[PDB]
């Protein structure tokens, strides 16, 4: 490509990862009015915000890999983009939690195709002299993606649907206005439309202004490898070194609590602290992302920094730092006070996934770089499984769980058996003689399912120290 040109190839390309993670994250944000709407248990929350990407790799990732270093290079971006931000319009209106999963589970086939097509669009579109900074800007989708979602939500929470009908009636999209009533449109509806609908807009503008790279403008003088360079075999000479299973396997829990967290967070905080969807995820779900990704940044650099010899790097032995983002994520559960609350998840948060980057570039540093490529591959896969599928499920059900137990220690089954989630918030009265008592165990049943879930980082520690013993045998020396 030319150079202000591959430029803006870039800018747009890191726009719609940024764009996917914004579709793919701002869920955990109208995580509570959904619930209220549809009136549903935290356990079908789990069920909504994790298993459903159990699809995104289990089809898609593989399919769309296969379809995407084969050809159709940009085509399948923008068809991509225009699949996945459908969808999301699509969950803005759904009947049934029923057609929120499969809204949910075909956002995901869409998203799967949007990084293996744009990641050889940047190599053949930059020359290996700066390829690197180059992939790197385009990662940074995720951080702004994250935070971006959140700010965004927020700001499109708590959002008069009355409000949203009379604008578009004010532009002249008056085939809204008589069509249906907007003040009994809830307002993450509006979040999903006005969040996904403009991926479209952006999908045809790439399929105009991109022009598809030849291919190959590489490196020059590369003999024929034969072997045909990493592929199934480079599993195998990972796959006999046990220190990647147990660093997989730590990361993949580390990010199993990071998931459940963020999964039922929003929830959190406006059960327990009584604060509105906007402040929620503005006054704290933002900035947290941010500390979330610093926290992973800082934890590479931290490896970066004394992995140049020194490796699995700790106070001594084992990772305790794990063992120590614990308390503080208890302590920020455990709290009256919401400013203790926000300073100590940020604490913890950075230990956190410090311990999450910091595996991850440890997991460069046990195998040949001819196989480094797909051995980051299989463990993201692994950690996005086991983490995304099961987090949330256990955050949720343990959720219901420790409700559940709650109500039968006061035998309240009788008021349940008529309790909606919404009524709790603002309906305060108009409930039953029972209904402060259930509200107080609909929180503490979270509250308590978060505590539980942090416990996770035990076996995160657990594999990580596991981990750190068999390393020495299986790290890769050039002598």
Same mark, same amino acid.
């Given at each position: 490509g030319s150079k202000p040109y591959r430029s803006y190839v870039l800018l747009a390309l890191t726009l719609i990862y940024t764009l996917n993670f914004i579709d793919r994250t701002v869920i955990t944000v109208v995580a509570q009015p959904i619930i209220n709407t549809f009136s549903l248990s935290d356990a079908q929350w789990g069920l909504l915000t994790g298993p459903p990407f159990a699809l995104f790799y289990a089809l898609m990732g593989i399919p769309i890999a296969m379809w995407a270093d084969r050809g159709n290079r940009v085509f399948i971006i923008s068809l991509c983009v225009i699949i996945w931000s459908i969808m999301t319009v699509f969950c803005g209106l759904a009947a049934s939690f029923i057609w929120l999963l499969l809204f949910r589970v075909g956002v995901a086939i869409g998203e799967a195709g949007c990084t293996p097509p744009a990641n050889s669009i940047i190599t053949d579109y930059y020359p290996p002299k700066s390829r690197a900074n180059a992939i790197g800007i385009y990662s940074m989708g995720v951080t702004v993606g994250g935070v971006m979602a959140q700010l965004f939500g927020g700001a499109l929470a708590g959002l008069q649907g009355a409000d949203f009908g009379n604008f578009l009636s004010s532009i002249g999209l008056g085939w809204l206005f008589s069509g249906i009533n907007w003040e009994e449109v809830e307002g993450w509806r509006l979040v999903f439309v006005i969040v996904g609908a403009p991926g479209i807009l952006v999908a045809l503008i790439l399929w105009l202004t991109t022009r598809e790279p030849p291919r190959g403008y590489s490196d020059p003088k590369g003999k024929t490898p034969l072997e045909k360079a990493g592929f199934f075999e480079a599993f195998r000479e990972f796959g006999a070194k046990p220190t990647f299973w147990s660093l997989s396997l730590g990361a993949a829990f580390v990010a199993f609590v990071g998931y459940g967290l963020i999964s039922f967070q929003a929830p959190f905080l406006m059960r327990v602290h009584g604060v509105s969807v906007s402040e929620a995820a503005i006054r704290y779900g933002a900035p947290l992302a941010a500390v979330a990704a610093f926290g992973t940044f800082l934890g590479g650099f931290? !490896?970066?920094?004394? /992995?140049?010899?020194?490796?699995?790097?700790?106070?001594? &032995?084992? *990772?305790? @730092? +794990?063992?120590?983002?614990?308390?503080?994520?208890?302590?920020?559960?455990?709290?009256?006070?919401?400013?203790?609350?926000?300073?100590?998840?940020?604490?913890?948060?950075?230990?956190?996934?410090?311990?999450?980057?910091?595996?991850?570039?440890?997991?460069?540093?046990?195998?040949?770089?001819? !196989?480094?490529?797909? /051995?980051?591959?299989?463990?993201?896969?692994?950690?996005? &499984?086991? *983490?995304? @599928? +099961?987090?949330?499920?256990?955050?949720?059900?343990?959720?219901?769980?420790?409700?559940?137990?709650?109500?039968r220690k006061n035998g309240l089954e009788e008021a349940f058996a008529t309790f909606n989630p919404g009524l709790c918030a603002g309906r305060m009265a108009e409930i039953g003689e029972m209904g402060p008592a259930l509200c107080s165990a609909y929180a503490e049943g979270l509250r308590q399912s978060m505590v539980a879930t942090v416990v996770f980082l035990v076996i995160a520690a657990a594999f990580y120290f596991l981990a750190s013993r068999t390393f020495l045998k299986d790290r890769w020396s050039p002598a």
């Open positions: 931290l !490896s970066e920094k004394f /992995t140049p010899r020194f490796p699995a790097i700790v106070a001594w &032995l084992p *990772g305790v @730092g +794990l063992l120590i983002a614990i308390p503080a994520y208890i302590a920020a559960f455990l709290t009256p006070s919401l400013t203790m609350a926000f300073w100590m998840w940020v604490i913890a948060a950075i230990a956190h996934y410090a311990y999450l980057g910091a595996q991850y570039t440890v997991s460069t540093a046990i195998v040949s770089p001819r !196989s480094r490529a797909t /051995t980051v591959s299989v463990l993201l896969l692994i950690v996005s &499984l086991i *983490g995304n @599928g +099961l987090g949330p499920m256990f955050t949720g059900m343990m959720s219901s769980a420790f409700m559940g137990g709650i109500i």
